[PDB]
Write a protein that binds this ligand. Structure first.
Ligand SMILES: [Cl-]
Ligand SMILES: [Cl-]
Ligand SMILES: [K+]
Length: 164
């Protein structure tokens, strides 16, 4: 288990444009295309991302390429965030993966609302942080995924993923 395998489980793999949990056009392994209700706008974003006229369908290799880019950009974004970087740096590798997962899911919305949770994580108050993380729209809207991510933050193990 690593961040790629973890996010692949949480995001799934679809080769045609579909709507995510929030109703937004997405493709591949959790690659959000747009928040616009226009399918044509989503198709245009897809073409831009892939570099060809896709008409809403991609290959597995193309999906994996976007996924590599998206994971990389999530990590780089964390490191460029002056407030978030210290929290990330304080974590072990397994909990770092949980942080990348959350950042990936939140996308452009970001994680500023998680400030109190992130402080508790930095303090290594794992059970307290887990309780605080669940007091969120995130947990309520995607509780199974949030429970997996929270267990990863709480324990620093892959227990919520390894036996699926
Ligand atoms: Cl709390
Ligand atoms: Cl869920
Ligand atoms: K998804």
């Amino acid at each position: 288990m690593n961040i790629f395998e973890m996010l692949r489980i949480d995001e799934g793999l679809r080769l045609k444009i579909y709507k995510d949990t929030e109703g937004y056009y997405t493709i591949g392994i959790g690659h959000l295309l747009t928040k616009s209700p226009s399918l044509n706008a989503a198709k245009s974003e897809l073409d831009k991302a892939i570099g060809r006229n896709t008409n809403g369908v991609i290959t597995k290799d193309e999906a994996e390429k976007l996924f590599n880019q998206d994971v990389d950009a999530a990590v780089r974004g964390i490191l460029r965030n002056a407030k978030l970087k210290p929290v990330y740096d304080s974590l072990d590798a397994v909990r770092r993966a949980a942080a990348i997962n959350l950042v990936f899911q939140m996308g452009e919305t970001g994680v500023a609302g998680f400030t109190n949770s992130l402080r508790m994580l930095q303090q290594k108050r794992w059970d307290e942080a887990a309780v605080n993380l669940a007091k969120s729209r995130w947990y309520n809207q995607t509780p199974n995924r949030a429970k997996r991510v929270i267990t990863t933050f709480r324990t620093g193990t892959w227990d919520a993923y390894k036996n699926l």
